[PDB]
Swiss-Prot record, chains A, B:
Organism: Homo sapiens
Catalysed transformations (reactions): O-phospho-L-seryl-[protein] + H2O = L-seryl-[protein] + phosphate; O-phospho-L-threonyl-[protein] + H2O = L-threonyl-[protein] + phosphate
SMART domains recorded: PP2Ac
Lineage of source species: Eukaryota, Metazoa, Chordata, Craniata, Vertebrata
Protein name: Serine/threonine-protein phosphatase PP1-alpha catalytic subunit
PANTHER family documented for this protein: SERINE/THREONINE PROTEIN PHOSPHATASE, SERINE_THREONINE-PROTEIN PHOSPHATASE PP1-ALPHA CATALYTIC SUBUNIT
Gene for this chain: PPP1CA
Curated annotation (Swiss-Prot), chain C:
Modified residues (Phosphoserine): S26
Official protein name in the record: Neurabin-1
Mutagenesis or variant effect for S26E: 35-fold decrease in inhibition of PP1-alpha
Name of the coding gene: Ppp1r9a
Function recorded in the entry: Binds to actin filaments (F-actin) and shows cross-linking activity. Binds along the sides of the F-actin. May be involved in neurite formation. Inhibits protein phosphatase 1-alpha activity. May play an important role in linking the actin cytoskeleton to the plasma membrane at the synaptic junction.
Covered range of the whole protein: 436 to 592 of 1095
Region of interest (Interaction with protein phosphatase 1), ranges: 1-68
Distribution of this protein across tissues and organs: Brain, and widely expressed in neural tissue. Highly concentrated in synapses of developed neurons. In developing neurons, concentrated in the lamellipodia of the growth cone.
Amino acid sequence: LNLDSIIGRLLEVQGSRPGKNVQLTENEIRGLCLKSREIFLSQPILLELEAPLKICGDIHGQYYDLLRLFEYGGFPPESNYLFLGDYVDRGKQSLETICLLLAYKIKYPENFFLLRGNHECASINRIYGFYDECKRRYNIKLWKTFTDCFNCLPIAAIVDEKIFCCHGGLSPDLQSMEQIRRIMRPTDVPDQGLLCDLLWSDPDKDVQGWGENDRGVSFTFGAEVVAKFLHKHDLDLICRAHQVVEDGYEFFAKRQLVTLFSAPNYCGEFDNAGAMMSVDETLMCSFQILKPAD
Amino acid sequence: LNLDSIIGRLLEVQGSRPGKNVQLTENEIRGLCLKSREIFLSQPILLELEAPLKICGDIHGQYYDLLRLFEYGGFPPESNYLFLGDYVDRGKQSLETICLLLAYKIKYPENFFLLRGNHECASINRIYGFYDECKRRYNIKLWKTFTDCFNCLPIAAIVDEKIFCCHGGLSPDLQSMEQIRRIMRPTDVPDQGLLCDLLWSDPDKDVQGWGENDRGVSFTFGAEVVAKFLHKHDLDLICRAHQVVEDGYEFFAKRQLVTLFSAPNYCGEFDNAGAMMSVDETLMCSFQILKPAD
Amino acid sequence: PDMEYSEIVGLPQEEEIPANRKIKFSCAPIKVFNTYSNEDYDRRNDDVDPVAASAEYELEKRVEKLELFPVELEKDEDGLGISIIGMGVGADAGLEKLGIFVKTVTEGGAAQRDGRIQVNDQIVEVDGISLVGVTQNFAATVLRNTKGNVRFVIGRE
Amino acid sequence: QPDMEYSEIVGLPQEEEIPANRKIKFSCAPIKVFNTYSNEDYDRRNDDVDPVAASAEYELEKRVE
Ligand SMILES: [Mn+2]
Ligand SMILES: [Mn+2]
Ligand SMILES: [Mn+2]
Ligand SMILES: [Mn+2]
């Protein structure tokens, strides 16, 4: 497995010109996928987590931005982490990104957590860059190993029975948490239905209940959907990711939902900060921001 | 194929602690093998070279010793090089060694030359380390790609019609240089015969003509064989490698044959220097020695 | 690691905190840490091509429904004794992303004499190079550059 | 970190009996000796090579093909 050596090499580029690659061996990467997969399967698909915790949204292969997040948030295991998915695609360093994340999951399996995003799906990461990066840097067989691993990622987390976390958002079909718990893994993400919505849906201030999503997949939901969901489930907050937001975090339905996004100046096409939300032992939530310099 | 980027990364470990790896992509390495195979096949199997030229013996995956050769001899294209084989096996970095050499071969095809050693042969480098390096760091299919490439390496060189160069030595079957020119590539190295002998035979002080070889392959040849071959073909010198010698170079049959060896403290089991022989445009030969410090 | 942060206005005071809410939101200033400028860290990616990726993918899905087998052919002075055609998916298949299929098997040639390769077989890999979703010229160039004992992966229904 | 400062040693001796029609020459000039890594700075040993174990594996790969 060689884990500490793998982590050392991944972290060696701290202080290098951003964009510099870390090229692990194919066998090393395979080993990460295989062990992390075992771990994901041994833990619930709907995680039950306790504060203190730091929550991050999309990274999209922006490896040197991920390194900064750990530098300011505290490297595992000094802080506990929950990531909300979308580790791969768009960025040029999906491989370094996902390998470091999987390494820390393997090293600290009770204190480090990764959810599945819509890009942790073969039909999506085939097209938006992760397959290309695997093909160029390794081979297509390694991309298939990643798919097997991704297909076992948990889908949602509940923090101290009060914060519901998933990549996308709610589903018109979601009535009981048991509907999430009963999803068997490995699984692909379908084109429609509960699992799709959890990874794909968006809040929208201009829709009342449920509307159509401009992505051509899943739905949008309004502030009233959020209020009823939280009331039904005795929850305080939905934490999700999935949309670029200018300051890295953005509330919806008052403070009832928050969107987190952790890829600063997203794929060099947006001017946005990244952010993380810290939840302390007493459940005090705060935001720390990652802003590109001018 | 990004040659300059490949060469940069292979050269970036200059000044690093010896033993540090350069991990290229599987595709970059396959591209090095395919491109260099095309060049090898477009050039004669018996090369006809013109001084100035620097001639080097075995490297055996001692990568940082290869870097030292170039640093003291001049990096291509500042100097012209002919290597006499045995790039892989025994050492821990056969991959970096062969990749740099192939890269330079592609980059400077008329100023940089590689002969086949007995270790550029699948049946040999299966068992002496190179297969293991490939399997560990890449995959077995990459190893077979190297075989495709090695099978097309030229076998011998003649410098300014006067210096006959090959890895091993002479053959009792060798009567005309046409017997070498007519060999078709790709080819494996047989267990016996002309092509075996060129890559495997050794000079011996104690043998008269042709003797038994302690290797269990090929033969030994004596001083008289050397004199006869030189007179027959109007040559002045045989330059070969294949045997570790204390000073990096060692004469035989007065100065009618020289053995060159370019891997200092050979696989940590010998105290020997490495050397190269420079031939200038007037056909003046000199030796430069690389000696491990105390 | 860079550890200096600035501070900005934090979250405003909430006017109506829901009655039995357990979590709290800090009003303290928000810490703002720096990461690289776009000049220092080019986060752009120009190589993402979703239309090319999709056509490749469809061909890969077809190949996975096939029976895959290895063939080794000794290439001689008469080549491999096959001719190839590229075929893609649908009427508007380009020239860019094709499957590569055996059009002819030359009588007396290496492919023919070996016995295994038949007309309409797909050539999926040659010497560890994928021929699934390539140009007919990429494919022809690869096959022409092959030498000696050539390794194929062949696909058949 | 490469040591460009070579030391010079006595060169090759002058040959007494040079072959009649020889074209090549051998320099009598001092030989340059460059310093390279000691074994302490560069451990060139390889414990990983096991030719006996590799041969057995190989024999099984050949029986497969
Ligand atoms: Mn995203
Ligand atoms: Mn998303
Ligand atoms: Mn040798
Ligand atoms: Mn040898």
